RNA sequence: CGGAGAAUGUUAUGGCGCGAGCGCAGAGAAAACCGG
């Protein structure tokens, strides 16, 4: 009948059409061909819908949350930022959708596993959390301004890549 | 007796009370004790009000937009970021208010003076725009998550629980240092 | 008090209730309608 699969697939399509500000559960119910009380069992309001959209965009496109076999910490942080940025760009206003959500327990566990990997490579526990925070804040900030100006030099990927590189070589220095 | 000075002063007080999501020109009109048609002459909608609020917090708190006498480019970028961050934190949801406003002509001129200062100090024109953009994106991202976090204070793994033992300023300062110490490398 | 988490509408120079004035409300509105 009507599973979480069609709910979120239709919700992500309507997010692209309308954006985060005009997206309503009523437009999703009409797009799905269901009454609003029926949809309330799968999504209870806009806040719950945005929470689900952000989680789904990460599971779909944030694939490089863990280091690969024999991958340097520099390459890991590099591809962790690119993966996170791809999720935010997977859909319209994806960074705005992500900013309004609260992290699940699985994301905290994933973050602890990242601190473990960084501390294993010579990072202090304090510096390992700062490196991950800085990369996240920079990536989120870059996409937020990029998607805000996407309503209208050009090309935000070079700015992101050169800034991510500035972070990585800065991390290398502060190790010594 | 309703001038632009009292409008934004009341508006920023109202921003702290209700936040960016609950801020409306009608609640501003009610706080000012005027009918909505009267307030329309000074601010035309929420978008115009947010544009004014973002500019006002910068003029008030973004004071270190220019290098001091004999101040290194490292110290300038450091204190330019700290000054910019102070503006975003000056009021509730200040980073969200800033995000979505379009730069005026004076900040383009102010920004040109910043590329000028950086290009003099050895930066390539290309690298000067990358350094300033990265510092801006990092500062904006840090305050956005920081201000989003202290709203969630209406309500975990131990190694993560060992790092939490407390605010966002230490993370901001160290991350800002990672950028600058990285900029030093990319010059050579 | 209930149909009802109704409709419509979004972020308000307007919409609405009472009657210049007082009052209501925002995507889990204010109105309007039906029922005891």
Residue numbers in the entry:
A (entry chain B): 3 to 154, 179 to 202
B (entry chain A): 3 to 157, 166 to 175, 180 to 202
What does the primary publication say about this deposited structure?
The crystal structure of TetR in complex with the 43-nucleotide-long TetR-binding RNA aptamer K1 was determined at 2.7 Å resolution. The complex consists of one TetR dimer bound to a single aptamer. In the complex, TetR adopts a conformation that is highly similar to the conformation that TetR adopts for DNA binding and which has been extensively characterized before. The aptamer adapts a hairpin-like L-shaped structure in the complex. The two arms of the L-shape consist of a 3 bp-long closing stem P1 and a 4 bp-long P2 stem. Although in the complexed aptamer, the P2 stem is closed-off by an apical GAAA loop on one side, no density is visible for the central two nucleotides of the tetraloop. Overall, 36 nucleotides, i.e. nucleotides 4–22 and 25 to 41, of the 43-nucleotide-long aptamer K1 could be modeled with confidence. A direct consequence of the symmetry disparity between dimeric TetR and the monomeric aptamer is that the two NBDs of TetR interact with two different aptamer surface patches. Six TetR residues, i.e. Arg28, Arg28′, Gln38, Tyr42, Tyr42′ and Lys46, are involved in sequence-specific interactions with the aptamer. Arg28 and Arg28′ each form a bidental hydrogen-bonding interaction with a guanine nucleobase, specifically G31 in case of Arg28 and G12 in case of Arg28′.
